[PDB]
Each structure stands twice: as structure tokens, then as C-alpha cells.
């Protein structure tokens, strides 16, 4: 019966909590003791990309750590050369309401999507000298909030219709659709080996999915408000999440439970974007108070701040070789910190 | 110069891109962006039918002025996540059907939406053009039945003028802060012609206020 089903679900949740807290021998902070801290490391801005004329909502690095793609509300997708601040490409968009941009690991394509409920794939390297649309991936019933490239043919797109999906670009159809996520899912982060991907939604629940199977492997809770940022640890066995609670939480796939929470009393603003430094020692988080805080991953302290932005820091990213970190903002400025 | 020939050509192409970006931004800055809002089947079609899937954007011109009006009603998702994207619009065209006071009640839902949106932290200083359409249907309904058909809080006359004024007062009293934004109200029906002018006066007033805030008098 329905009461029987609800009781079974509650008993299953209690059993899962008991199993989760049984394996919780110790927390990361207790283990990480008698060890030299990272130190009060501070970085200086090296470049300043000054092309956009509206709020910047997303940025993505290339695999070569040189090219950079940024999206903004003036209907412009600009490709940057971070070394020389040269503008390689400036791609007009049919819809200026975009919230995410993606850069293919092969570098031949970019992907952007937003309130028009479509993910657009743009061909960077054409016989003609321009950037052209390849396919438009319609099929979501909400705004697209994140999208990442598996390869030149597979792209996984989050949405505001509470679902994630995996697309076949050549056919323009969803090979598998990821459902079972109450509330709009706001972010996603592919695994380093591109066989799993996590996604955080407005229900403060982060789910881990199997790309081929299509089923949610694990579900993580602990956030008090909705989830805006998510990113895999370099090791592939952990991932961090940023929420409106002014808290960053480190989870663990192989423990199915939260490791530690990064927070400070002086911080009450939401968290917009999160990313990990190479070797996973530093956690880089973008906030609503116009500032980005360098969180030491092992401990729960701030390694340093960078500030340098006059409006909300909406996005950030770290290069594949860890040379620099680029932060976007609502003041239409990108800064390549090093 | 410590630059190769192709580096110089790259900087030249980047400067051409910069010129085009400046031109595009200067062209966009001469456009008025309006956020259409309101429940479905609440006269939104009538007010969008005067001139010229997710957002359904419409573009219309009047007296050498260009309007970029956006309809986001079909989002059907958590507004708080994407509502800041429209922060900075010229004005909000909020459409409410008068006749939907008995058809679980549509007027209560519209009032809740108006209270949520008009008091949003993003929109604390944007004017609201409250369009009150379907007044002939309100005429017929009031002739058939007074507003007290479902609302016992009313105590006035069962006439169209007084009831419409009472509804307008109740809507305009929803906002906590009257000292920071101006709520414009209009009465329209299926066949009007001067509806396009009311938004023109509203946008002219907010343009003047923006100029005053720019120079710093305001």
C-alpha cells in the first residue's frame, strides 16, 4: 500500500543512514593533523579580458591551457587567447539569455545554452573562415544550466526541468536521459575518465550517474539550500559542491558521505562556481560578495582571497596544467590569476 | 616591437573584433528591454497582438524607439534561479485579467505572483506597467454577479467602476515600497488602440529617471 511504500522508503533511508554513519570512522580534519598547512598564499591578476558588455555567466578553459571561451548576456560568445588577451573568435548568439558555455577537449567545437531551452554546438574549425552552428539540441523543457563535452560526438546537458541528458550530436537525439532529481539541476561535472558525472539540483541533493547505464549510482545530501556549483576532484573519487548556504562541502564517492564543510561566519553570500586546483590541495570557489576564496581542501581554512571584482563572481575555471585560474563576473571582466 | 608578422595580424584581427563588439554594444544600449509577465490566458495575447520552446521575444517600434519585450511565462521552473537574468530591464509589463476573480481562485494566484515579483530584490527600482485587461468580461460578470460572489472582504458597491478601482487599489497596495518604484496601471480590453502609448509614457518616465540617476541628481 501507499502507507506501506512510504514506510519502506523511510526504513530504507534510516538503514542507509546507519550504514553511512557506521563506516564514518573519522573525519578528514581529524586525520589531517600534525601537518604543515598550505600557508597564506596570495596571487596577483596577470591579465584582464575586457571585451564583454554585459554580465558574464560562464567560462570554460581549453585543454591546451591557452584558449578560453566566455559567455555573456549581450548575446556574445568570445574565444580568448589568455597569453596575449587576443580575441580569436567572437560568436553571436541567436538567444542572448545563456547561462553555460562548454569547450570541447578537441578544441573544434564550443557549446552554449540558456533560457531558450536549446544547446547549440558551434563549429570552430571550418573550411570557410567563420564559426557556424553544427546542430541545435532541442529536447529539454527548461533552461539549460550546464553542459560538458565527452568527446566530439557526446555531450551531457543539465536543465531546469529537473533532468540531465546525454546527447548524440550527429543525430541530435538523447541517447540516454537521466531522471529522478526533484528540483531543477543547476550544475554538472564530468569524471576525469568520462565514465561518470555528478549533478547538483535545487533540492540540495547531488547525484552520481552512470553515463552508459543511465541510472543514478549514488545520491548525496547535507546542503541546507539549493546547489549551484559542482566539480570533480582530480583523483576522481571525490567532488565538491557549492550552495546558497555560503558553504562548500566535500563528498566522497567511495564513502558515500560528506568529508567536511568549508564555511566561515563572515561569509553569508551564496556560492556561484567552484573548481579544484591541480593536485586537489586548493578549492577555488566563486561567491556573491564579489570575491573568490582559496579554500585549502585538506583542512577547512581559507588559504587566501583574491577579490579584484566589482560585481558578483559568476564563474571560474582552472587550467588543465594548473598554470592559472580564470574568474568571470557580472561586471563583464575576466581575470587570469596566477 | 618584439612581435612576429602573424602576431601583428592577430592583433589587427582582435582590434577588428573589438570594433565590432563596441558597435554591437552601442546599438544594444539604444534598446528598451521589457519583461512580459503574468498568468497564461490572462489577456497576454491581446496585449502582445498589437504589433509583431522557451522565451518568446518580440520586437516592436513606436515613435522611433525600439522595444525588446520578452515573454518568460512558459519557463515553468524555479524563478529565483533565473530571475536575476532580467535585472536591469526598463519596465515589467505585468498582465492581469479582471474577469478571473471566480474562475483555485485565479485572482489570488495573480496577487501572490505580483507580491513575489514586484518585491523581488532584483527589481527594487524598476517600474511596473500593470495592465488590467478583459474589462468587458468584467462588465458582463458584474452585471451577472457582484465581486462579493467569492470575496467577503469587499463592502462597496456592485458597479464596474468601484469594483475595478478596488481591485486596482488592492494590487497597488501589494508592494511594501512605494518610495522606490512607480506602478503604472491601465485598463484595456480586446479592441484597444492607445495601449501602445501607455508603455511609451512609462518608458519615457523611467528613461528620464535613469538619466537623472546617471548625472547624480537622483
Amino acid at each position, epitope marked *: 500500500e501507499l502507507d506501506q511504500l512510504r514506510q519502506e522508503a523511510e526504513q530504507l533511508k534510516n538503514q542507509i543512514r546507519d550504514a553511512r554513519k557506521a563506516c564514518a570512522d573519522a573525519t578528514l580534519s581529524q586525520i589531517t593533523n600534525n601537518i604543515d598547512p598550505v600557508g597564506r598564499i596570495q596571487m596577483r591578476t596577470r591579465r584582464t579580458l575586457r571585451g564583454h558588455l554585459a554580465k558574464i555567466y560562464a567560462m570554460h578553459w581549453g585543454t591546451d591551457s591557452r*584558449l578560453l571561451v566566455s559567455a555573456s548576456q549581450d548575446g556574445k560568445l568570445i574565444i580568448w587567447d589568455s597569453y596575449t588577451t587576443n580575441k580569436v573568435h567572437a560568436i553571436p548568439l541567436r538567444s542572448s539569455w545563456v547561462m553555460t558555455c562548454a569547450y570541447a577537449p578537441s578544441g573544434n567545437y564550443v557549446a552554449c545554452g540558456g533560457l531558450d531551452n536549446i544547446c547549440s554546438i558551434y563549429n570552430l574549425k571550418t*573550411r*570557410e573562415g567563420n564559426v557556424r552552428v553544427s546542430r541545435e539540441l532541442a529536447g529539454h523543457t527548461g533552461y539549460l544550466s550546464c553542459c560538458r563535452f565527452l568527446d566530439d560526438n557526446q555531450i551531457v546537458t543539465s536543465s531546469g526541468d529537473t533532468t540531465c541528458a546525454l546527447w548524440d550530436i550527429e543525430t541530435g537525439q538523447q541517447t540516454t536521459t537521466f531522471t529522478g532529481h526533484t528540483g531543477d539541476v543547476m550544475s554538472l561535472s564530468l569524471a576525469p575518465d568520462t565514465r561518470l558525472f555528478v549533478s547538483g539540483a535545487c533540492d540540495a541533493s547531488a547525484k552520481l550517474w552512470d553515463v552508459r547505464e543511465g541510472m543514478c549510482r549514488q545520491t548525496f545530501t547535507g546542503h541546507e539550500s539549493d546547489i549551484n556549483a559542482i566539480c570533480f576532484f582530480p583523483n576522481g573519487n571525490a567532488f565538491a559542491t557549492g550552495s546558497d548556504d555560503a558553504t562548500c562541502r566535500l563528498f566522497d564517492l567511495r564513502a558515500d558521505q560528506e568529508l567536511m564543510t568549508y564555511s566561515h561566519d563572515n561569509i553569508i553570500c551564496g556560492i556561484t562556481s567552484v573548481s579544484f586546483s591541480k593536485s586537489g590541495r586548493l578549492l577555488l570557489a566563486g561567491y556573491d560578495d564579489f570575491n573568490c576564496n582559496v579554500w585549502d581542501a585538506l583542512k577547512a581554512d581559507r588559504a587566501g582571497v583574491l577579490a579584484g571584482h566589482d560585481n558578483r563572481v559568476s564563474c571560474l575555471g582552472v587550467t588543465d596544467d594548473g598554470m592559472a585560474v580564470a574568474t568571470g563576473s557580472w561586471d563583464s571582466f575576466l581575470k587570469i590569476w596566477n | 616591437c618584439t612581435l*612576429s608578422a602573424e602576431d601583428k595580424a592577430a592583433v589587427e*584581427r582582435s582590434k577588428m573584433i573589438d570594433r565590432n563588439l563596441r558597435e554591437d554594444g552601442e546599438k544594444a544600449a539604444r534598446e528598451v528591454k521589457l519583461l512580459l509577465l503574468g498568468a497564461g490566458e490572462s489577456g497576454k495575447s491581446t496585449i502582445v497582438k498589437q504589433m509583431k520552446t522557451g522565451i518568446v521575444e518580440t520586437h516592436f517600434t513606436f515613435k522611433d524607439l525600439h522595444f525588446k519585450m520578452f515573454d518568460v511565462g512558459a519557463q515553468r521552473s524555479e524563478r529565483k534561479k533565473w530571475i536575476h537574468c532580467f535585472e536591469g530591464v526598463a519596465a515589467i509589463i505585468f498582465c492581469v485579467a479582471l474577469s478571473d476573480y471566480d474562475l483555485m481562485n485565479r485572482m489570488h494566484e495573480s496577487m501572490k505572483l505580483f507580491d513575489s515579483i514586484c518585491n523581488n530584490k532584483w527589481f527594487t527600482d524598476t517600474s511596473i506597467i500593470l495592465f488590467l485587461n478583459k474589462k468587458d468580461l468584467f462588465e458582463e460578470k458584474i452585471k451577472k454577479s457582484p465581486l462579493t460572489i467569492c470575496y467577503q472582504e469587499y463592502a462597496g458597491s456592485n458597479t464596474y467602476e468601484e469594483a475595478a478601482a478596488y481591485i486596482q487599489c488592492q494590487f497597488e497596495d501589494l508592494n511594501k515600497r512605494k518610495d522606490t518604484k512607480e506602478i503604472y496601471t491601465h485598463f484595456t480590453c480586446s479592441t484597444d488602440t492607445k495601449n501602445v502609448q501607455f508603455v511609451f509614457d512609462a518608458v519615457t518616465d523611467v528613461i528620464i529617471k535613469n538619466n537623472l540617476k546617471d548625472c547624480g541628481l537622483f
Partner: single-chain antibody
């Protein structure tokens, strides 16, 4: 993507003419066009360069004054007005498209060419091989010499390789030292370091035989080299 060039013919010395080339099938207005000359028996010689948006314009020292380069972006046409033609100006002229940004491939396409007959510092880039005979299925390694280092301070070596099969316009093979172009087989591989460079073909076919040219883009003017002909 085609570049059909027109004009040309028999012109008496000291006369004037207007070379034209119509671009189609690609974004003409975003490409920096070149003009490259080839005498009936000699190699390739660079003539003029115009940038995107008609910005920087370059001429070689031997063509300045009497040669002018212009483009019509809405008309999709590139012009080359020539006056006071000398006896050394008889050659075939190729319209070459080029685009310059990070990771791009300049000189990626060449026009069909037009003929012109008239009655009658720089970087030295020469290669010391010519008319090398070789059989299909073998491996070749031709080399090019530069007067000075072609390695720029940013880490890029500006050396290009071109194959001119007989009866048709040259095509780009290597668009920078160790950078293979699009549509050319993986058997080709440019290499080199410092001042000396070379091009190796692993298993040549029977159709990739012709004149091989090494060109520099380090400084203007762009200096080609004498060819290295390959035959059966």
C-alpha cells in the same frame, strides 16, 4: 572554396593592367589576401599582402610604387592594379587567401592563377637540392636552409612547405614547422630546429611528385626558395 582569377594577357612594356580575383565559398572579408608571382621557369615570388579590413598593406622592394593592391569586400573581389610593366613582370599570378589568429593555417588555399606576358634585409631561403629522382614506396627527406634563425621568441618557427604538382596551382602541406595541414596525408612530416629545417615523406605515392617550396613568414617580404623537383 575557390579563387578564380581573371585579367592578364599580352601587354606591351610600360603599360597598365588590373589583375582581379573573385572569392566565393568562404568568408572573404575576414581573410588577408596575398599575391604571389611565378616566372615561367623560376620559382615563386611574393608580390603584395593586404590584411583583413584593408589595414596593413605590404609590398616587396621590387614591386613598390607601380603595384597597388585593393579589395572589394561587398563585391567579393580582389584587385591588383599594375602600371609601367617591366620585362621581368611576365609570370603567372596566384591569389592566396590567408587568415591570422592563434593556431590558424595561413596560405591554406591558392587560386587557379592567371597568365601575363610582357614583350622584350631580406631573408635568404634557398635549398641545395633539385631534380631528385626517387621511386614510389621509398622515403625521401628534402631540406631547406635559412639565412638566420626562423624561431621567433614566442616559440613558433615560421616555415611553410608547398607542393606544386605539374599543371595545377601549389597547395599547402605544412603551415608551420611541424604542423600538418588539412587534407594532406600523415606520411608528410615537417621538422627541423634552429636554422636548418627539413621535410620527410615516409611512403610517397605516385601522385605527390612535383616542385617543393620552402617559404618563411617571420618577416616581410615573404621569401620563397628555389624548388626541389621530384620525378620517377
Amino acid at each position: 572554396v575557390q579563387l578564380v582569377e581573371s585579367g592578364g594577357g599580352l601587354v606591351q612594356p610600360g603599360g597598365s593592367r588590373k589583375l582581379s580575383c573573385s572569392a566565393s565559398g568562404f568568408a572573404f572579408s575576414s581573410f588577408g589576401m596575398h599575391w604571389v608571382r611565378q616566372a615561367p621557369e623560376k620559382g615563386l615570388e611574393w608580390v603584395a599582402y593586404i590584411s583583413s579590413g584593408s589595414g596593413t598593406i605590404y609590398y616587396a622592394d621590387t614591386v613598390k610604387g607601380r603595384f597597388t593592391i585593393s579589395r572589394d569586400d561587398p563585391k567579393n573581389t580582389l584587385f591588383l592594379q599594375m602600371t609601367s610593366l617591366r620585362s621581368e613582370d611576365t609570370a603567372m599570378y596566384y591569389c592566396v587567401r590567408s587568415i591570422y589568429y592563434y593556431g590558424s593555417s595561413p596560405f591554406d588555399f591558392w587560386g587557379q592563377g592567371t597568365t601575363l606576358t610582357v614583350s622584350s634585409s631580406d631573408i635568404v631561403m634557398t635549398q641545395a637540392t633539385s631534380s631528385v629522382p626517387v621511386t614510389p614506396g621509398e622515403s625521401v627527406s628534402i631540406s631547406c636552409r635559412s639565412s638566420k634563425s626562423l624561431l621567433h621568441s614566442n616559440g613558433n618557427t615560421y616555415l611553410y612547405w608547398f607542393l606544386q604538382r605539374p599543371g595545377q596551382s601549389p597547395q599547402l602541406l605544412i603551415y608551420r614547422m611541424s604542423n600538418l595541414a588539412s587534407g594532406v596525408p600523415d606520411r608528410f612530416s615537417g621538422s627541423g630546429s634552429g636554422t636548418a629545417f627539413t621535410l620527410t615523406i615516409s611512403r610517397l605515392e605516385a601522385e605527390d611528385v612535383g616542385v617543393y617550396y620552402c617559404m618563411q613568414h617571420l618577416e616581410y617580404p615573404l621569401t620563397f626558395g628555389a624548388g626541389t623537383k621530384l620525378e620517377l
